[PDB]
Amino acid sequence: MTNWESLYEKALDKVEASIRKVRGVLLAYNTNIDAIKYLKREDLEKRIEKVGKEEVLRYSEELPKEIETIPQLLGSILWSIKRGKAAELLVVSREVREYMRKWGWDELRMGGQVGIMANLLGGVYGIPVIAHVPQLSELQASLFLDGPIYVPTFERGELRLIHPREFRKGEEDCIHYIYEFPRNFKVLDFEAPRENRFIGAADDYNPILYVREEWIERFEEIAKRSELAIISGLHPLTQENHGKPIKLVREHLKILNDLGIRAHLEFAFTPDEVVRLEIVKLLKHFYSVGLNEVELASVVSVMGEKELAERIISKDPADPIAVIEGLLKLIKETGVKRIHFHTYGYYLALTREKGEHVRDALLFSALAAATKAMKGNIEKLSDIREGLAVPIGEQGLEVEKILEKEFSLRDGIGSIEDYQLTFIPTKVVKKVGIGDTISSSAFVSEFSLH
Numbered sequence: 001m002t003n004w005e006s007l008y009e010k011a012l013d014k015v016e017a018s019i020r021k022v023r024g025v026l027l028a029y030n031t032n033i034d035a036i037k038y039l040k041r042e043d044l045e046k047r048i049e050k051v052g053k054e055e056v057l058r059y060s061e062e063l064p065k066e067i068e069t070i071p072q073l074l075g076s077i078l079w080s081i082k083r084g085k086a087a088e089l090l091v092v093s094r095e096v097r098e099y100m101r102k103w104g105w106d107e108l109r110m111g112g113q114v115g116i117m118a119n120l121l122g123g124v125y126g127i128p129v130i131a132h133v134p135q136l137s138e139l140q141a142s143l144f145l146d147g148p149i150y151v152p153t154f155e156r157g158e159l160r161l162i163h164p165r166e167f168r169k170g171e172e173d174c175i176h177y178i179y180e181f182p183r184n185f186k187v188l189d190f191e192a193p194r195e196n197r198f199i200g201a202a203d204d205y206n207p208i209l210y211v212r213e214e215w216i217e218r219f220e221e222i223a224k225r226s227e228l229a230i231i232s233g234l235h236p237l238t239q240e241n242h243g244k245p246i247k248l249v250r251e252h253l254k255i256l257n258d259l260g261i262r263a264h265l266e267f268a269f270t271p272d273e274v275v276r277l278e279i280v281k282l283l284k285h286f287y288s289v290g291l292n293e294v295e296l297a298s299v300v301s302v303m304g305e306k307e308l309a310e311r312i313i314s315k316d317p318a319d320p321i322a323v324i325e326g327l328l329k330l331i332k333e334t335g336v337k338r339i340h341f342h343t344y345g346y347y348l349a350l351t352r353e354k355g356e357h358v359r360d361a362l363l364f365s366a367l368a369a370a371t372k373a374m375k376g377n378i379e380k381l382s383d384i385r386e387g388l389a390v391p392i393g394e395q396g397l398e399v400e401k402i403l404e405k406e407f408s409l410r411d412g413i414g415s416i417e418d419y420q421l422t423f424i425p426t427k428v429v430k431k432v433g434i435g436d437t438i439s440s441s442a443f444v445s446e447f448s449l450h
Contacts, residue, residue, distance in 0.1 A: 002400070002411055004392055004425060011363035012384060018448040019125050019381070025444060026226035026261070027114045027121075028132035028215065028252070030206040030233030032174040033140055034111030037104065039077070039181045045188060047103075048074050053188070067091040067200055070099050077179050077198045081187060084194030088176075090201050097202045100177050110143040111176050112206060113232035113266070116433040117440045120368075122149035124378045127444065130226055132215055134205035135171040136164055152222045154214055159221050174203045207236045209245035216248065220255050228447055229261050230440055231286075235268040237275045246278055253285035262287035264338075264443040266436055267295050273302050283334035290340040290439025293318045300326045317345045317395040320402055324348065324421070331419070338446075342426075342438045345395025349422040349442075353450070358422045359412050361446035366426050368441045373429035387427055396425020 048056045051070045059075025060082060067073050067089050073096055080087050091097055110119050114131050122129040123145025130150050133140065141164040150161035177200045185192040201207065215222060223229070231253075237245060256263050263286050270276040280299060283289055291299070293313050301309035308329075311322035327339050327350045340362070341348040347362045367387035372378050374386065400409070403423050407414040412423045 005388070007359070007411060008363050008367065008427070009388060011360035012367055012388070014357075014360050014449060015364040015445045016381065019127060019445060020448075022127045022227060022444060022448050024128040024130060024226040024228075025117075025121050026130050026223055026229040026256075027117055028229075028231060028233075029114060029134070029209055029211060031110075031112040031115040031118075031131065031133040031136075031140070032176055032201075032203055032206055033143065034109045034178055035105035035175050036107040036109065036178045036180060038106050039179055039185065039187075041185070041187050044074070044077070048078075048188065063087060064089060067096055068093050070096055072096075073100070073200055076200070078187070078190065080179075080196055080198040081181055081185060081192045082190045084183075084192050084196050086196050086198070088199035088201055090203070090207055091177075096200075100200060100202060101175075105177065108139075108143065113268070113433065113436050115143070117230060117232075117436055118149050119143075119145045120378065120437055121440065121444060123147040125381055125444075130161065130222060131164075132212065133164065134210045134212065135174045136167050137171045137173045138169055139173050140171070141165045141167060152214060152218075152225075154218065159218070159225070161225065174205055176201045176203060206233060208241050209233050209237055209249070211245065211248050219252050220259070223252075223255055223259055223261060226261060228444060229256055229263040230443065231263055231265050232268070232436070234265075234275070234279050234282075235270040237270075238272045239274050242272070242275050242278065246275075246282070250282065250285070253282065257285055262447070264288040264290065264439070266439045267291040267299065268435075269295050269298055276302050280334065283330075283336055286334075286336050288338035288340065288443050289330070289334070289336050290342065290435075290443070292341070292435060293323070293343045296323065296326050296330075296341060299330065303329075305329070317399055318343055320346070320348065320399050320423075321406060324350070324416075328416075328419075338443075340439050340442050342435065345393050345426055345428065346399045347424050347426065347438070347442075350416075350419045351422065352419060354415075354420045355450075356413070357446055357449035358420060359424065360449055361442045362412075362422060362424045364445045365438045365441035366424055369434055369438050370427040370429050372434060372437055373431045390427035390429055392425045393428035396428075399423070400425055 055071035056075040060078035064072045118129045118131040121127045128148035144164045180197040183195045297309040297312040337352040370387035370390040403409045
């Protein structure tokens with residue numbers, strides 16, 4: 001058997017030494033505020049009564065396309081509760097937003113793929129970040145950590161990087177209200193199958209991939225102050241609104257390519273199939289892509305390999321060889337140099353680049369994931385050491401045995417064609433932005449190790 005605990009310890013020590021070499025990561029585009037409310041039975045019942053139990057129940061059987069009224073909000077909540085399933089809808093009514101603001105919340109956290117990675121890369125790991133923030137209100141700014149986290153501003157056309165807390169006041173709050181409920185939560189006559197949540201997004205900016213004027217007119221000058229880039233926030237775009245923003249992203253990718261700045265994308269699930277296909281075509285401009293089993297299956301599916309997509313998500317844990325067939329398919333169609341697959345019990349990477357540093361980056365990112373799941377947050381880099389005590393999970397060990405026999409992985413490493421195949425078993429706490437912590441941590445630390 002492999003001494004995974006020794007490899008995990010060495011990987012952490014190596015990344016702690018090397019992570020300081022990264023000069024700057026550019027992070028765009030989606031940043032918001034997350035406001036979490038822990039639902040309570042009597043309050044939720046009374047609010048449903050006030051607005052009409054009848055209408056609310058109607059929307060619990062069939063989700064609205066968006067939330068225009070308070071019965072739509074409450075009924076959407078109820079939909080998630082009785083399916084124990086997560087859903088998110090835009091809230092497009094000012095009256096409903098006011099209703100939600102007054103109903104309030106219990107916990108305030110940074111939100112958005114940019115915001116959370118700024119706090120992780122910048123605040124925890126100490127790597128300078130340049131972050132794209134659609135609306136940097138005082139509240140938005142207050143949620144950034146300490147450390148080298150910057151937003152670009154321009155004085156006499158001169159670029160100045162400043163901490164969010166020093167940015168001018170005036171912009172508005174982009175709040176996603178996260179309505180959480182426990183297992184078997186009861187309301188009226190329903191009880192939730194699973195613990196879960198409904199998200200009402202009171203957000204006019206990120207759902208359309210809003211881009212700040214200065215990042216449209218001065219992108220090259222901004223990008224020149226970074227060494228790596230992580231692009232995020234494409235997933236909500238639809239056939240209606242994708243035109244202008246995809247054109248912006250493509251122009252920005254070409255500049256990053258001209259500047260030699262390697263870019264990573266976590267291929268978050270993208271419901272609109274046309275846009276999902278457009279993101280696939282954008283992948284030609286990326287060095288690296290990350291995805292999980294649902295995402296990989298979604299992508300293989302829209303490409304017309306419906307049988308393979310079914311296999312990718314069919315077994316728990318995912319039939320690793322089907323996964324690898326999907327990765328090999330994607331890596332040859334797109335030309336990306338790096339694909340990091342992450343699921344519950346294990347990660348895989350398929351890379352043109354070779355060596356132990358690919359494995360060490362995956363192990364580090366799994367420690368970060370385990371520390372975040374356990375603590376809920378990460379405050380300091382050396383706290384990741386706590387992940388060393390988390391046991392490796394049964395599913396990871398089961399998949400290792402399959403990959404040891406079918407590829408000839410030693411200490412998680414083997415080769416197929418001109419790729420290295422890298423595997424690690426995850427340390428599972430099982431208790432957010434975990435997926436982004438995983439694929440951003442592996443991407444940045446692998447580069448720091450090289």
